[PDB]
Amino acid sequence: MKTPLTEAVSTADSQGRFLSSTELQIAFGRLRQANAGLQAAKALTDNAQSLVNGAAQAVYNKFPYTTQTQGNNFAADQRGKDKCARDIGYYLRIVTYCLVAGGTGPLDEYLIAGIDEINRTFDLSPSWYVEALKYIKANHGLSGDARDEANSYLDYAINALS
Amino acid sequence: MKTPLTEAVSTADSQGRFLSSTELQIAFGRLRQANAGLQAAKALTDNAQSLVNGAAQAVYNKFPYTTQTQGNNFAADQRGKDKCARDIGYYLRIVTYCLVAGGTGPLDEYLIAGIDEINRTFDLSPSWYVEALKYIKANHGLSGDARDEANSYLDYAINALS
Amino acid sequence: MFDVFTRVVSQADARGEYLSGSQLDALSATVAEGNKRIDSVNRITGNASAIVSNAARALFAEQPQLIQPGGNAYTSRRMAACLRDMEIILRYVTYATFTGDASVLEDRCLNGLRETYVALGVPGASVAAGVQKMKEAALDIVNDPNGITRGDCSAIVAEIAGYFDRAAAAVA
Amino acid sequence: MFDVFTRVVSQADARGEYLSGSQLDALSATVAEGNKRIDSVNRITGNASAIVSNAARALFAEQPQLIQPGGNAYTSRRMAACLRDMEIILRYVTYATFTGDASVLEDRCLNGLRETYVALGVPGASVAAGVQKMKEAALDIVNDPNGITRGDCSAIVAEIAGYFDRAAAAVA
Amino acid sequence: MFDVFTRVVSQADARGEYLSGSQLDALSATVAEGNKRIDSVNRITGNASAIVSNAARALFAEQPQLIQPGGNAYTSRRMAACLRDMEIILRYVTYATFTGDASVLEDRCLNGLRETYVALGVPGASVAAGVQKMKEAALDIVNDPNGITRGDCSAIVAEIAGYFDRAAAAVA
Amino acid sequence: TSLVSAQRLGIVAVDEAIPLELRSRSTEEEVDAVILAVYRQVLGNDHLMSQERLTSAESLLRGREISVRDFVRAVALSEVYRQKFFHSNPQNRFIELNYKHLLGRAPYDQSEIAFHTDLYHQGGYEAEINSYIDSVEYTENFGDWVVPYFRGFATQRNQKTVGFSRSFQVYRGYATSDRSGSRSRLTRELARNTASPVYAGSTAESLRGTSAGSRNQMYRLQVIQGAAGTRVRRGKAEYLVSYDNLSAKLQQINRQGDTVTMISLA
Amino acid sequence: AITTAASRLGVAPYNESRPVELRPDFSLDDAKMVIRAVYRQVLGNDYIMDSERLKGAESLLTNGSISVREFVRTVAKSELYKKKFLYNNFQTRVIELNYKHLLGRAPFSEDEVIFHLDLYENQGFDADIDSYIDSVEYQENFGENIVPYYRFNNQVGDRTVGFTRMFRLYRGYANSDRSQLERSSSRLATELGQNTVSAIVGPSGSNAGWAYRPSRAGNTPAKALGGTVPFGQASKLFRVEITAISAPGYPKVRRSNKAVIVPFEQLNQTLQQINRLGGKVASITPASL
């Protein structure tokens, strides 16, 4: 799982090496970041319901056909809106994992890998989730390093989807 | 290992029961004993070389043919004397384990189970080790509960050998 | 299975050495904690039914999908089995607390439990959540300062937490 | 492979839950100790050759059966392999210390190691004795007060000891 | 299990064939050797305890790690199990000598024995060395010219050596 | 595979492995890393003595005179590889070692064994080794510049499902090696075109409770049985018995004439 | 087999039952049937309270973590089995019970008592239990997957004395090993030591003389040594076992149980006299040739 600490070790291990100053500097970089990530994770968690709901409606506003067309892949009925808010919650929850982990590991392992197969298979538009992610970027209220690290993971998801 | 604590749990588990006052009282019994057992173990350990060498010499005195007769099972050469001292040390060290564990569990597991087959296979006389064990009983200088518990384990081995 | 004492003995025997004065003193300090350990086992055991039921209630409230029709704890037999497992795990945790060593819990309860659950379809993460709920209740009961001689139980409480965590990880 | 952070994450995802405020504070307290952890890795690494060689010499002095002709560490190839294993285990102990989680030991160093030793006839109890000796030498190195900002490293030393114990138990 | 006669029968039945004149003649030669075979079985049996104990002593003399503390043959129960195993193998080797066919040894002794030792952590290469020591003692006993009608037992000795070799190969 | 399964099966490190490719204008460190990875893979993770290293082949690779695939082949044809895996092994064990080392998988069917036994009988050792490295499977997975890596734990195009189960017979864990010859664990299941249960990582474990005797250990005996007593319901059976009853169980199986295929701790 | 006398001997219900087998891929109802059968067989048809159930062993059986035989083994080694059958019994009684529960038959010979008494004394109860379950006899009859059951019918390897002794240990269907007239006493200590047998007395309800039991001393021997000479002119002798004698009362009646050897020519008088004593005929057996 992509994270500074686990990547320092797996790289050293692949080279048969003890950890050296380089991996120690990696750890210092992790320590410099971690509190902001944990602060960012807390802030996103506390507003999870608001962000998820606002993101869901932002998508509904931008793609009104989703709340009006009948179909398993759309949110016209109640199940679809539940599926949709669930999916957006997945994105937001896993992003906080990335802030906690200090890397894209959680996004790669839990969401990104295979998402293209899923969206094709169930006829789910990547654009819907991009709009949801864009909303969370604009509304999470973070600042400083917490904002920077958080937007990197949101953008990483956006780039993966587009 | 037969120790008070493991036996209590094993009997409770056989009945699918949580521990009750009976087992708590087993624990108090162990606690009442344990400090004395540990003090005995330290005293035997500190005097181990004296006790082991003395015990070996006591066997050689009572059974002089063991140091005079040629044969793999006897101690007429340095090879045999070393085996013998090693064996007596085994008895002493494991007895200290019994004092630490609070039961014959270590003697049962490490030494007593199968001793008959060994003594028969390699033509060792159990009377030799009885004599060594009597020497140790009579020279450990323990008093009180430490003496009582140490001698119960020394007698347990003697009884097993006879 | 080992207790705190025989754990050290077995390590010493494999090296063919007497216990050091440092090891013996460590055991002496354990003996000095014995009353606290006995109280902790007594307190958990005295409250076992409550610990299990309250944890199970809380668990299903957070995970209603377990008890909806078709859920893994749906139907009396499966609910009954689930409640039974929660008590088994608690019971073995108290065994480990009593002995002062995790071997009873690991050897008899946890070894092979994950595989049983995976084969059955029992959701390990939900079992682990249940175990965590039981852990919190158990630790509060142990730490309750009323009706007991006052003193510091942080060491024993930490040991008990470790045993609960072992159980949670073994199935999680 | 997990580190101290992703271990928590993996459990939380299995429940579909955000990290709790307590888990975040817990991870924050981990960050607070980060410098101590980095120093401990740095110190063991700086003395790795001496730790390994001193432990090896001590092991063969306690267990001279290993190096006499016919012994499992007799012949240069076998001695060389034995020394490599000691170094390998120590290296992976530093990895676990670095990451703050045991998974790297369980995934890589210890994964099948007992099977390997049984197949080869390597005396696993003896390997455990050698690991214990590196452990004692490593913790003294970590606890050395000289030339370092003084502070209390007891938590990390206890964690490191756990990693050494895990290695020893895996082959014992 | 098969003996020397039924081994041939089984092969013939699978072909739907009467034994040929050559096959019958070979069994007649086997019959003519029967007294030597009985004598070999009687000699090995009559020295079984000495064969086993002498072999065990020699093994532990050459491989002292087996009996050092923490060694697989250390402690009375393990030592007794080891001596038991040696005697078992010797017993089934005598059975194979008696019947003139390895099947009893293969089916009833060596069946799964390598896997059993691997699972138990018993050093199979050391069992093999033990079996070789018993082999060498047994063959000298069988070949002893004193107190027996003189004759050539080379063929039976080779057959017995073959059975010992199977056992040593199988356990390793 | 994903964490939930890889953790139980002891293959997390395999899953997170990244193919190593030798790029244009590589550094000395990158060549060194590649040489190390080749030795680990092709020699099945043996401890490699400095006296055993291919000095010349290493030089040529470092000089970009030969490709990574050429260097893999140099190591596979070396006397080190032969001594480790060929001279003391039966042929079928040798062949599955070649599949593990060179293609990173387990053999799929008996005909693969037959093909390679024929090739060895026809063109000898070099022709046998070259068949793996020159194969379409080698070229399309690793080409000329990527070090081979174990593939058997991932769904491959044109594999057989049983390749996944069999992988656990030839890959025994991260801290293992193909050093002791020995026999193939795959012989029977290849010959009869069947599969065997996967007991790896922690999947061998079974519950003890109060039924596992004095040592709290269960042993899993896998047997092939027939009706030569009570009725036999399956030709393949497993028994879980405690240490104390293990001798009695072996003797029971032995007396019935049934074959023990595997025993392990549970 | 046993057909005509099956009902009066209490065998008919077992004639009507099949062995309880746990098939591979068994269903939960299969597991429940095994558990019920094992509790009834191995615990001698004692009522089992919910607090006494071996819930963990039952779980492991249901899960396939232990086979039927290993579940039997666990029940036999449990504190529940030992409380019922070990702690309060003479070891010869324990051996009788083990044979009935785990092998479904009665001991054949004194050699079996020697073996199991020494095994218990040298290695403990658990070791002794294993000897029954790991025995060749257990393997041949029940194997890994069948609950032990009473082996009333003649099999290869049997001895006749086994058949008569089963009705010293089995006292009917609505009965348990702990609810029999002889209570804790060994049923077979004397039979085994002397290698003798006793006339079969079937269960209550279907046999009026079901309570007949001989005393410690002063019993009538089985066979009429001396023939008809003491009786004068008599064609043949029979040994009649009589129980529940009360009518004359003490001291005219001392023991309510009595066995007499009487000639054919007095059987009419004997039955008449027995009836007037209030007694019930337990068994009649030819005593001369």
Ligand SMILES: *[C@@H](C)[C@H]1/C(=C/c2[nH]c(/C=C3N=C(/C=C4\NC(=O)C(CC)=C4C)C(C)=C\3CCC(=O)O)c(CCC(=O)O)c2C)NC(=O)[C@@H]1C
């Ligand atoms: C227990 C392990 C011992 C111990 C450790 C300890 N270290 C610090 C503080 C620091 N250690 C470092 C480490 C490095 N700086 C570098 O540039 C590199 C080389 C690449 C390393 C390894 C740093 C950066 C700090 C912080 C600044 C400082 O120099 O103090 C502490 C102080 C507390 C803290 O958390 O920082 C402690 C306790 N101290 C002992 O007494 C043990 C023997």
Ligand SMILES: *[C@@H](C)[C@H]1/C(=C/c2[nH]c(/C=C3N=C(/C=C4\NC(=O)C(CC)=C4C)C(C)=C\3CCC(=O)O)c(CCC(=O)O)c2C)NC(=O)[C@@H]1C
């Ligand atoms: C190699 C094994 C050695 C050897 C054997 C040998 N023995 C005989 C002949 C006989 N041996 C026996 C054996 C027994 N008679 C008994 O009553 C018993 C006890 C139950 C035994 C074991 C017998 C009956 C004979 C035949 C009579 C005789 O004494 O000759 C021979 C002779 C060849 C033959 O087949 O008869 C031989 C060669 N002789 C050696 O020199 C080897 C060291």
Ligand SMILES: *[C@H](C)[C@H]1/C(=C/c2[nH]c(/C=C3N=C(/C=C4\NC(=O)C(CC)=C4C)C(C)=C\3CCC(=O)O)c(CCC(=O)O)c2C)NC(=O)[C@@H]1C
């Ligand atoms: C000393 C009292 C007398 C004596 C001793 C002697 N012993 C042996 C050989 C063995 N002793 C043991 C005993 C143990 N092994 C264990 O693991 C333990 C339990 C932890 C015990 C008690 C064993 C097993 C052996 C045989 C194997 C071995 O050598 O280790 C000998 C040599 C016997 C031989 O034939 O080589 C001797 C000389 N002999 C005397 O005359 C003393 C009076």
Ligand SMILES: *[C@H](C)[C@H]1/C(=C/c2[nH]c(/C=C3N=C(/C=C4\NC(=O)C(CC)=C4C)C(C)=C\3CCC(=O)O)c(CCC(=O)O)c2C)NC(=O)[C@@H]1C
């Ligand atoms: C109604 C007559 C009274 C009542 C009901 C009540 N029940 C519960 C909780 C549970 N009920 C069940 C029952 C079943 N679960 C099943 O799967 C099936 C078989 C198909 C049955 C019959 C169970 C298992 C529970 C506990 C778990 C759960 O919450 O689902 C409650 C709540 C109890 C609690 O502590 O939460 C209540 C209130 N209560 C009354 O007062 C009514 C008169």
Ligand SMILES: *[C@H](C)[C@H]1/C(=C/c2[nH]c(/C=C3N=C(/C=C4\NC(=O)C(CC)=C4C)C(C)=C\3CCC(=O)O)c(CCC(=O)O)c2C)NC(=O)[C@@H]1C
């Ligand atoms: C409750 C929090 C969760 C849950 C549990 C659940 N478990 C089972 C089934 C079994 N549980 C065990 C475990 C044990 N048996 C033992 O003897 C011991 C001690 C060694 C343990 C730990 C076993 C063996 C089984 C299988 C056999 C049995 O039924 O007892 C079930 C039933 C599964 C089924 O489909 O039958 C359930 C429901 N399920 C949840 O959803 C909760 C998260």
Ligand SMILES: *[C@H](C)[C@H]1/C(=C/c2[nH]c(/C=C3N=C(/C=C4\NC(=O)C(CC)=C4C)C(C)=C\3CCC(=O)O)c(CCC(=O)O)c2C)NC(=O)[C@@H]1C
């Ligand atoms: C720890 C979580 C809490 C705590 C425990 C504690 N207990 C004691 C002392 C004793 N407790 C007992 C217990 C029992 N006595 C009995 O008869 C039984 C029933 C079978 C039990 C369970 C005993 C005997 C003692 C010693 C005598 C006394 O009167 O105290 C202490 C004091 C220190 C000591 O170990 O002796 C402590 C600290 N105390 C807390 O404050 C925690 C909430």
Ligand SMILES: *[C@H](C)[C@H]1/C(=C/c2[nH]c(/C=C3N=C(/C=C4\NC(=O)C(CC)=C4C)C(C)=C\3CCC(=O)O)c(CCC(=O)O)c2C)NC(=O)[C@@H]1C
């Ligand atoms: C003698 C020329 C000089 C010398 C020797 C010396 N050697 C050691 C230690 C070891 N020597 C070896 C060598 C071998 N072991 C083998 O198995 C083989 C192949 C058959 C060889 C050649 C080894 C492996 C060791 C280390 C482990 C052991 O002690 O067995 C020492 C002691 C070193 C230490 O630190 O303990 C010494 C003194 N030293 C001199 O000064 C001489 C000029």
Ligand SMILES: *[C@H](C)[C@H]1/C(=C/c2[nH]c(/C=C3N=C(/C=C4\NC(=O)C(CC)=C4C)C(C)=C\3CCC(=O)O)c(CCC(=O)O)c2C)NC(=O)[C@@H]1C
């Ligand atoms: C002696 C030369 C070596 C040695 C032996 C050793 N074996 C065991 C344990 C077992 N050995 C067997 C083997 C058999 N049991 C049988 O019934 C048969 C015939 C069918 C055989 C071949 C078994 C089954 C066991 C385990 C069960 C049991 O003991 O009954 C041990 C003890 C293992 C342990 O205590 O964990 C030992 C020591 N060990 C050495 O070091 C010698 C090289």
Ligand SMILES: *[C@H](C)[C@H]1/C(=C/c2[nH]c(/C=C3N=C(/C=C4\NC(=O)C(CC)=C4C)C(C)=C\3CCC(=O)O)c(CCC(=O)O)c2C)NC(=O)[C@@H]1C
């Ligand atoms: C979907 C209905 C269910 C499900 C599926 C699932 N499968 C896997 C993993 C594998 N599936 C296969 C199967 C094949 N591979 C092949 O090449 C062939 C054709 C020749 C088959 C049939 C294999 C080999 C694997 C393992 C290797 C790999 O994953 O690539 C998973 C992943 C498990 C994990 O932890 O990664 C899943 C999820 N899962 C469900 O819940 C459904 C019931």
Ligand SMILES: *[C@H](C)[C@H]1/C(=C/c2[nH]c(/C=C3N=C(/C=C4\NC(=O)C(CC)=C4C)C(C)=C\3CCC(=O)O)c(CCC(=O)O)c2C)NC(=O)[C@@H]1C
């Ligand atoms: C030294 C304290 C003891 C000892 C060691 C010894 N080990 C081997 C052989 C191997 N050791 C390993 C272990 C690892 N390889 C890895 O890659 C990892 C990390 C993931 C580990 C832990 C392996 C795989 C082998 C086999 C491969 C190889 O030997 O090259 C030997 C050599 C045995 C032999 O030559 O046959 C030795 C000697 N031996 C002792 O006596 C010490 C107690």
Ligand SMILES: *[C@H](C)[C@H]1/C(=C/c2[nH]c(/C=C3N=C(/C=C4\NC(=O)C(CC)=C4C)C(C)=C\3CCC(=O)O)c(CCC(=O)O)c2C)NC(=O)[C@@H]1C
């Ligand atoms: C045939 C000439 C007469 C006859 C025979 C008859 N016998 C039975 C039933 C049984 N016979 C035995 C006898 C033995 N069991 C033993 O173990 C031994 C020695 C090993 C003997 C001799 C037994 C025990 C039974 C009952 C149990 C069983 O049969 O399995 C019957 C059937 C009784 C019934 O059906 O109720 C019969 C018919 N009957 C005649 O009329 C012939 C004169």
Ligand SMILES: *[C@H](C)[C@H]1/C(=C/c2[nH]c(/C=C3N=C(/C=C4\NC(=O)C(CC)=C4C)C(C)=C\3CCC(=O)O)c(CCC(=O)O)c2C)NC(=O)[C@@H]1C
């Ligand atoms: C209740 C009205 C009266 C009463 C009853 C009582 N009975 C027992 C014990 C047993 N009852 C039976 C009966 C059966 N078991 C069966 O399997 C069958 C059907 C085929 C029947 C009819 C048995 C065998 C027993 C003994 C087994 C056991 O576990 O007890 C008791 C228990 C006596 C005691 O525990 O000491 C009692 C109390 N008692 C009264 O006072 C009521 C008049």
Ligand SMILES: *[C@H](C)[C@H]1/C(=C/c2[nH]c(/C=C3N=C(/C=C4\NC(=O)C(CC)=C4C)C(C)=C\3CCC(=O)O)c(CCC(=O)O)c2C)NC(=O)[C@@H]1C
């Ligand atoms: C020794 C002082 C006298 C003596 C004893 C003797 N006893 C037997 C045989 C048996 N002894 C028992 C005893 C017990 N069974 C139990 O369950 C218990 C309580 C737990 C006891 C004490 C039994 C049942 C037997 C029969 C089985 C057996 O033979 O072991 C014998 C043998 C008699 C025979 O004919 O074989 C002897 C010799 N004999 C004397 O002369 C001494 C006065």
Ligand SMILES: *[C@H](C)[C@H]1/C(=C/c2[nH]c(/C=C3N=C(/C=C4\NC(=O)C(CC)=C4C)C(C)=C\3CCC(=O)O)c(CCC(=O)O)c2C)NC(=O)[C@@H]1C
């Ligand atoms: C009174 C405490 C209990 C009790 C007694 C009771 N007894 C009988 C009947 C008989 N009692 C005997 C006793 C003996 N015969 C002897 O030879 C001796 C030793 C020398 C004794 C003690 C006998 C033979 C009988 C039957 C003949 C007779 O009735 O006189 C009864 C009457 C039985 C009946 O069914 O009528 C009773 C009531 N009953 C209880 O409930 C008390 C516990």
